[PDB]
Symmetry: C3
Subunit: 243 residues, 3 copies
C-alpha cells in the first residue's frame, strides 16, 4: 500500500512514497490510516533529520478526483470521513521533523490538499494543481478551506475552490502554490538536494523553529513573541549551539 526508504550521510534522510500507481495514487481510508502511523502521530525516531514525501508512479501525486468516488452513505459518517482526513494532514503538518513536499504531476482533490500540509513544495514542470471537489457536488473538506487562505492569500483562495479547474505549475509557482520548480527529469535528485542541504544543519535548531512557527500562526503577533522566546531558550539548553 506504501513504501519508504531511509538514506543520507549518516542515515538522516527518509522518503515516503504512496504506492498505488495503478489507481493514479488515489487515497482512501486504508491508505490514509497507514500514513498516520507512518509519521508516528507527531513524533518520529532519532535517526532521521528531515523527511521527504512524494508519490510513486511518476504520473500524479494523488489524483483523488477521477477515480475516488464512493460517498453514497449516511451523512453521519461524513464526520469521521472528514476527521481522518484532518488527522493525516495535521500529522503531516505538525510532524516532528520537517518534510519537503515533491509534487510529481497531477495533484487534485485531496492529493493537492495533502500537499498544503507540508513545509516546502518542490514542483515538477508537468504538474497540474487545483481543488476540483465542487464539480462533483461537495466542497473540499480534507482541510483545504483554510490552507489556500494561508498559503496563497485570500484573493487566490476563493478562485480555485469556486471553479474547480486546473492551473499550470508555472501559475501555481506564480501565486505561491509551489515554492520552486524543477524539471520532471530532475525531481528525484533535486528533492533530496534541498534535503541534503537541510540535513547538514543543527538537529534541534530546525525543529525548534518548527514549533515556534507552527504555533504562532493561530495567535497574534504579540503572543507569538512570548511563544518565540520559549523556543529560543529551548535551543540554549541543548549543546548544538555551543559547538
Amino acid at each position: 500500500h506504501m513504501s519508504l526508504v531511509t538514506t543520507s550521510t549518516s542515515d538522516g534522510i527518509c522518503t515516503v512514497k504512496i504506492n498505488r500507481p495503478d489507481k493514479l495514487n488515489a487515497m482512501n481510508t486504508d491508505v490514509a490510516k497507514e500514513l498516520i502511523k507512518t509519521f508516528e502521530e507527531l513524533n518520529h525516531n532519532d535517526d532521521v533529520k528531515v523527511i521527504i514525501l512524494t508519490g510513486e508512479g511518476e504520473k500524479a501525486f494523488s489524483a483523488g478526483a477521477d477515480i475516488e468516488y464512493m460517498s453514497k452513505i449516511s451523512a453521519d459518517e461524513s464526520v469521521e470521513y472528514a476527521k481522518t482526513g484532518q488527522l493525516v494532514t495535521a500529522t503531516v503538518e505538525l510532524v516532528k521533523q520537517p518534510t519537503i513536499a515533491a509534487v510529481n504531476g497531477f495533484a487534485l482533490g485531496g492529493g493537492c490538499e495533502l500537499a498544503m500540509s507540508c513545509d516546502i513544495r518542490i514542483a515538477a514542470d508537468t504538474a497540474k494543481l487545483g481543488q476540483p471537489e465542487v464539480t462533483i457536488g461537495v466542497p473540499p473538506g480534507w482541510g483545504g478551506t483554510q490552507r489556500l487562505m494561508r498559503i496563497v492569500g485570500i484573493a487566490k483562495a476563493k478562485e480555485l475552490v469556486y471553479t474547480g479547474k486546473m492551473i499550470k505549475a508555472e501559475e501555481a509557482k506564480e501565486i505561491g502554490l509551489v515554492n520552486h520548480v524543477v524539471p520532471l527529469a530532475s525531481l528525484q535528485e533535486e528533492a533530496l538536494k534541498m534535503a541534503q542541504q537541510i540535513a547538514g544543519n543543527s538537529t534541534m535548531g530546525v525543529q525548534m523553529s518548527k514549533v515556534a512557527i507552527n504555533k504562532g500562526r493561530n495567535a497574534d503577533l504579540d503572543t507569538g513573541l512570548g511563544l518565540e522566546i520559549l523556543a529560543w531558550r529551548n535551543c540554549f539548553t541543548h549543546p548544538d549551539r555551543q559547538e
Copy 2:
C-alpha cells in the same frame, strides 16, 4: 443609480451596474444605501446563483475617491458615513452568491474599497487602482486599512496608503490586488464565461464554501477546521450530493 440584467446561460447572472456615467460611478450616501436594496440586506433571489459587478460606460468601475467627497462638517456625523460604507462593503463581501469585480478602468478610494469586498476580482489592463486617502487627509475608512492588508498581504498595503499613488494594471496583479488582469473589454465576455464555469458546478458546493471561507479569514486553523466540517456536512443532506 442601478440596473439588473440576466442575459446568460443557466439564468443566474445578475451583474450590478452603477448608472452614473457622468461622475465616474462615484460613491456617496445616495448610491450606497441603494446597493443594500439591490443586495437585499444579506439576501438575494434564488434564481440568481452567481453575481459580478462593474461600472457603466467602461470608463470607471467606481471612482468615489476624490471627485465625490462631501465630509467637511460634524466629525460626529462622519461616523455614519464610514458605517454606511462599512455596511455596503460588508453586504457585498458576504452576499449569498459569489461576486466578480469587473473593473472597467478607474477604481480608487471608496470605489476600490467596493472592489476589494469581492471574493474573485478580474481586472482590466487600463486599471488605475489605488488608495490616495492620505493626500485628501483621511485614513481609509471603508475597510481600506483592513481589506487591502488581508488581500495583498501586509507588506504591500504600507506603500499604497502611505504614498497614495495610482498603480496601474500590471503592478496590480503583481501583488494580488486583482486575481487576473484579463481584458478590460472581455471582462464581460470572459467573466460571464468565467461565471458560467462557476455556475456550471453544484451551487451548494459554492455558497457553503463561501460560508466556511469567509468566516475563517481571521480565526485559528483548528477552529477554521471546525467551520468547514459543518459546511462540509451541510452538503451531505441535500439532493446535490448523489445525482
Copy 3:
C-alpha cells in the same frame, strides 16, 4: 554610534545612519539600545515627518548573524537577550513616523529582523536577505519566525528559515518581502523621493493608518473595524481635514 542628518522640504525627513563600519555595523546590545533611546526622541519630535534607517556607504546593512555571536551565558541571560532583541524590533515598528527601511546589501540576522520590522523595505539584487541562524544552532530570536511568516507567507517563510540560505534580494522582490527595484547608483534619491511622497501628505492621516494597520491585522475583521473607525474619526477633529479638501 550614529547620526541623524534630517533634511527635506521644510526639513522633516529623517535618515538615521548606523555607524560601525569596522564589523559591518554589528548588532550588539549597545546598538540594540542606542536606537531605542533616539527613536523615542524621534517619537517625541513632531517636526520630523519621515524616517529612514540604514548604514553609511556601499557595503552592507548589518551582518548580525555570523559576525557578532556571543552565545555563552547559561541560558538565563539569553532570555534577556531575547527580551532586549524583541524590544529593539518593537519600537521601530511602532514609532510614530513611517519607516522606509531601504535595505542596503547584507541583511542577515539582526539587520534582517530589523529591516522587516520597518514598514517599507526596498531591496537590491546584490543585497543578501536570508537567515543563517539555524546552521549555528539557534533560531532567529528577534522575530524571524513570526515576522517572515506574516509578511510573505508561511509557505515561503519556512524555506528561508529552514535552509538558512542567502537568497539574492532580487528573488525577494519576486518572493514579496520587499518593495522596489532600481540600479545601484543612488539610494539617496529614490528612497528619499518616496519619502517626499509621504512628507507631501497629511501628517496624521498616515499615522491614523499606521496605528490602524499595525493593530487590526491580528484580531478578526469585526474587531479590526473598531480601530479602523476610531482612527478615521481622529483625522477629522484635526484641522488637516478641512485644509486639504479645498
